């Protein structure tokens, strides 16, 4: 199972990683001359985190449109993913507080989460020592930064068997890559046609020949 594998890339890609298909034409994860933010472990961690966040965003950007079209949500609430107030020139919506107040609140909460994550990445078992209202016991981590586990992050006990765990890791990385591609498609479509992706799918299904990339670009 090799995709565009090169002689240089096949040397250090031993297959001991989920979704390791030996694909690296530019040789970024080469194991000599590694420094700064270029290191195979950091790159793998970043890929996993990107996949998770992209899956969350891809689900959340397409849920409201479908929910509104099905009639399960009030019409004034269902909006395309760029009319929600992210891009004020495209559109704006009103909430229970100003946009910048919500920005500050999200920044504070995400800082509290992400600084603890970063300190865990730096020192493995340090983060579960200091008193944190008793929660630190569940935040010790499993020693692998990518998959901390523990009661808080693995309450259902999934992936006890090593083979099942490997299969689940492969599923996670594949779904993350798919969601990243989907988010890129969302961005480009919203840049070109200026309409939510669900409406694009509906128009394509209504008449595929008259609705595609070519007709908008005309010729």
């Amino acid at each position: 199972p090799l995709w565009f594998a090169s002689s240089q890339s096949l040397s250090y890609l031993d297959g001991s990683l989920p979704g390791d298909y030996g694909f690296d034409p530019l040789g970024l994860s080469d194991p000599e001359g590694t420094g700064g933010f270029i290191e195979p472990r950091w790159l793998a961690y970043g890929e996993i985190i990107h996949g998770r966040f992209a899956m969350l965003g891809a689900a959340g950007a397409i849920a409201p449109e479908i929910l509104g079209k099905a009639g399960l949500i009030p019409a004034e609430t269902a909006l395309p993913w760029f009319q929600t107030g992210v891009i004020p020139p495209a559109g704006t919506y009103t909430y229970w507080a100003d946009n910048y107040t919500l920005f500050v609140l999200e920044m504070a909460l995400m800082g509290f989460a992400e600084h603890r994550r970063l300190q865990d990445w730096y020192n493995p078992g340090s983060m579960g020592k200091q008193y944190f209202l008793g929660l630190e016991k569940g935040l010790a981590g499993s020693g692998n930064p990518a998959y901390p586990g523990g009661p808080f992050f693995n309450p259902l006990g999934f992936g006890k068997d090593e083979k099942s765990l490997k299969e689940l890791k492969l599923k996670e990385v594949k779904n993350g890559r798919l969601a990243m591609l989907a988010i890129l498609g969302y961005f480009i479509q919203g840049l070109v046609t200026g309409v939510g992706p669900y409406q694009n799918l509906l128009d394509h299904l209504a008449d595929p020949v008259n609705n595609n990339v070519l007709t908008s670009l005309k010729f």
């Binding site: 001359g33 590694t34 700064g36």
Partner: peptide, 9 residues
């Protein structure tokens, strides 16, 4: 071949 080679600190 062409690659990034760095020294740390």
């Amino acid at each position: 071949e062409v690659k990034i080679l760095v020294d740390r600190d």
